[PDB]
Amino acid sequence: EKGDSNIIGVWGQGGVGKTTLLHVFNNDLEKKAHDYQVVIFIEVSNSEALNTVEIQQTISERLNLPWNDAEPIAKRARFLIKALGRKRFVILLDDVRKKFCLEDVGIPTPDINSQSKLILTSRYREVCFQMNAQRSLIEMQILGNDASWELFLSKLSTETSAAVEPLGSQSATREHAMKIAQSCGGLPLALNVIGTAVAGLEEGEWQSAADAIATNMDNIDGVDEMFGRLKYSFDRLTPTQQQCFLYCTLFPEYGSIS
């Protein structure tokens, strides 16, 4: 509402909630009153190769434009630059993984003289700096202590939640469930996956699962595809950076190193 720069960048680790933030922000615009005319949501996460074609398809479909399939990409980009310049637009870019030129995809870069805005989310602060969003960066932080717990509770079945929800009656199962929740580090993706994995835990099994979750996470359901999802930030690295990152994993947990 108030920021001077018209390009806004949101950055955070994988699974912190950037895409969900964009969803809840786009859905929130239809509730309030605003001067903007189109709110376009674009998924650049499809690839790092920048598939121009379906991004232009989304922009044209969102602008009530006819899809001239045989038109060259550059001509369509110029046409979209002309078209988007006539409207006060908001474009929400999702998980942009490389620097890409907006004018080659059809999006005009918003400037001070224009009311249009452009919000992009990415795991890398370097990308948000490359896309001229340095003066309006936001860090997407992990969830709080209580919000993470009440997210974990909603992920459990009714009978299972009936064991860890109640207070007044005191038992160690609440402590074990809280230990499992804290093992997720407040990462919403972690809360979802871990709560789904242990959504049907019986009363007597919480102890062993909580004890094992503190040391390893290979035997728990659904975490393999989690690490596959989060692994791209590691695969992007050069081999020296990969070795330097793995070298840091052998330091003690919960311990800051110099």
Partner 1 sequence: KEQLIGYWLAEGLLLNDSEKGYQIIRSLVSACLLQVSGSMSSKVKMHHVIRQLGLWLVNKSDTKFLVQPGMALDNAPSAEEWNEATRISIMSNNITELSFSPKCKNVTTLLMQNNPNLNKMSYGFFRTMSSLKVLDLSHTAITSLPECDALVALEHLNLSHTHIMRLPERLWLLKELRHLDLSVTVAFEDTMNNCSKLHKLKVLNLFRSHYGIRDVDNLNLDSLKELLFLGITIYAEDVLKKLNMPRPLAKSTHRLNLKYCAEMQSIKISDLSHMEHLEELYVESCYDLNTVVADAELTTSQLQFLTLSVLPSLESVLVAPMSHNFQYIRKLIISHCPKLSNITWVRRLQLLERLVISHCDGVLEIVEDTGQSDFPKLRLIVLTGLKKLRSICKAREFPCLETLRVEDCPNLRSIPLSCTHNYWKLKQICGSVEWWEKLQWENRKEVACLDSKYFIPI
Q: Which of 15, 108, 110, 186 binds ligand ATP (CB under 6 A)?
A: 15
CA distance 70 to 47: 23
Query: Contact, 123 vs 74, CB < 8 A?
Result: no
Give the nearest distance from C-beta 161 to ligand ATP in angstroms: 16
Q: Which of 165, 211, 224, 225 binds partner 1 (CB under 8 A)?
A: 211
Number of amino acids touching partner 1 (CB under 8 A): 20
Does residue 160 belong to the site contacting ligand ATP (CB under 6 A)?
A: no
CA distance 140 to 128: 13
* Rg of the chain on CA atoms, in Å: 22
Q: In this complex, which beta carbon is closest to its own copies, that of residue 80 or of residue 95?
A: 95
Q: How many CB atoms lie within 10 A of CB 188?
A: 17
Question: 248, exposed or middle or buried, with CB in 10 Å at 0-12, 13-18, 19+?
Answer: exposed
Point out which residues pair with 139 in neighbouring strands: 11
Which of ligand ATP, partner 1, its own copies, none does residue 48 bind to, with CB < 5 to 8 Å depending on kind? none
Give the nearest distance from C-beta 170 to ligand ATP in angstroms: 28
Query: Contact, 151 vs 143, CB < 8 A?
Result: yes
Q: In this complex, which beta carbon is closest to partner 1, that of residue 211 or of residue 225?
A: 211
Which of its own copies, ligand ATP, partner 1, none does residue 111 bind to, with CB < 5 to 8 Å depending on kind? none
- Dihedral, CA atoms, 52, 54, 59, 62, nearest 10 degrees? 180
Q: Which of 16, 93, 181, 220 binds ligand ATP (CB under 6 A)?
A: 16
Q: Which residues contact 17 (CB under 8 A, 6 or more apart)?
A: 140, 143, 188
Q: In this complex, which beta carbon is closest to its own copies, that of residue 88 or of residue 125?
A: 125
**Which positions from 198 through 257 interact with ligand ATP, judged by CB under 6 A?**
229
The site string for partner 1 over 163-202 (x = CB under 8 A, - otherwise) reads: ------x-x----------------------------xxx
Q: Which positions touch partner 1 (CB under 8 A)?
A: 123-126, 142, 169, 171, 200-205, 208-209, 211-212, 219-221
